[PDB]
Design a protein around this ligand. Structure first.
Ligand SMILES: Nc1nc2c(ncn2[C@@H]2O[C@H](COP(=O)(O)OP(=O)(O)OP(O)(O)=S)[C@@H](O)[C@H]2O)c(=O)[nH]1
Ligand SMILES: [Cl-]
Ligand SMILES: [Mg+2]
Length: 342
């Protein structure tokens, strides 16, 4: 359990259309992905890597005394489409994650794809918190940019505080009807068993510090302890696409283990196993999206979890969703081809 064998866990963001999943991530990243999107909607799985240094800075306003202990090296956050036509991608993102944020519009409560998401979460026993987003839409909300929720909530007028309590109670009742007990996050005395509700605004940043602290807490206090450390390689192909200068590449979620430039890799292809070597192992800059076209950073080595793009010859027939394996010293290359096909 050395700190040079720590693993960055995977957090999926799930929720109904237009609840603010991408906008929340844009506020954390300081990006404008949502503005860029056709229709303002997400149509693919996105991956952004957050080094723990950034998480520490973005939670300082709810950790002023420094007493919160950070143990993760970072977190890979997966953005997903809420639109009904992409249930396959919510399913894939859910299958990949270790923990999750379920985004609910506080003004609307639970909606059809919230219910779909809750089924995914319950089935896989995924620890999650709920972001009750768009609190700035409470009428008369007075913002302090990027504040902790409690601090800001204390400064609101009586009308706003009453409206919040009323909507919060309604949402709690909705979750209870779906079989989930939930509590406002600082009122939750059973983090292991009850869902924490953290009110947020993607527009003002309020509550995001609380939300980030909570997902680190999910990693450190709910996720299986073994997942804090790197073990055997696990990787999944997300997409296959030709990129200028690199030929047909694959975007991969590295879920566990370590990938290296030059690795002999095996994966499923249309006509049978593909066996090739990694020519370039690419990532976005930290806190930038895998689903966004850009210049890429080349790495000799990438430790899990991360979203990577791999350049290699012979990827033309790669199958999205395929597992990916690396040929190790004690492996037989053909035997490994047979194992990936399984
Ligand atoms: N006022 C306010 N508006 C918000 C907030 N969060 C998101 N929005 C707005 O809601 C709209 C939808 O946000 P978006 O980030 O696209 O949702 P999404 O959950 O990613 O939606 P999808 O990709 O599943 S279709 C956008 O216009 C965005 O500006 C918020 O906290 N306050
Ligand atoms: Cl949970
Ligand atoms: Mg989106």
């Amino acid at each position: 359990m050395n700190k040079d064998n720590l693993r960055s866990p995977i957090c999926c963001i799930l929720g109904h259309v237009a609840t603010g999943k991408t906008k929340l991530l844009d506020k954390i990243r300081q990006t404008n992905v949502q503005e860029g999107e056709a229709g303002g909607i997400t149509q693919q799985i996105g991956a952004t890597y957050f080094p723990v240094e950034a998480i520490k800075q973005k939670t300082a306003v709810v950790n002023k005394d420094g007493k919160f202990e950070f143990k993760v090296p970072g977190l890979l956050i997966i953005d997903t489409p809420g639109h009904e036509s992409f249930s396959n991608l919510r399913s894939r993102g859910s299958s990949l994650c270790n923990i999750a944020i379920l985004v609910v519009d506080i003004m609307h409560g639970l909606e059809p794809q919230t219910i779909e998401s809750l089924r995914l979460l319950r089935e896989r026993k995924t620890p999650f918190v709920v972001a009750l987003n768009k609190i700035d839409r409470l009428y008369g909300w007075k913002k302090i940019e990027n504040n902790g929720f409690r601090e800001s909530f204390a400064l609101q007028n009586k009308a706003v505080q009453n409206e919040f309590r009323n909507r919060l109670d309604q949402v709690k009742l909705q979750f209870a009807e779906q079989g989930f007990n939930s509590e406002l996050f600082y009122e939750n005395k059973n983090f292991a068993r009850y869902v924490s509700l953290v009110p947020t605004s993607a527009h003002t940043g309020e509550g995001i510090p609380d939300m980030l602290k909570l997902i680190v807490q999910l990693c450190q206090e709910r996720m299986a302890s073994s997942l804090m450390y790197l073990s055997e390689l696990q990787a999944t192909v997300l997409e296959v696409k030709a990129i200028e200068g690199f030929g047909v590449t694959i975007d991969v979620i590295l879920s566990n283990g370590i990938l290296r430039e030059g690795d002999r890799i095996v994966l499923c292809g249309l006509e049978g196993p593909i066996k090739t070597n990694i020519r370039a192992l690419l990532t976005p800059a930290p806190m930038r999206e895998l689903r966004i076209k850009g210049q890429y950073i080349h790495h000799k080595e990438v430790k899990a979890a991360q979203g990577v793009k791999i350049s290699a010859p012979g990827l033309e027939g790669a199958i999205a969703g395929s597992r990916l394996l690396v040929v190790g010293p004690d492996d037989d290359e053909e035997e490994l081809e047979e194992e990936v096909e399984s």
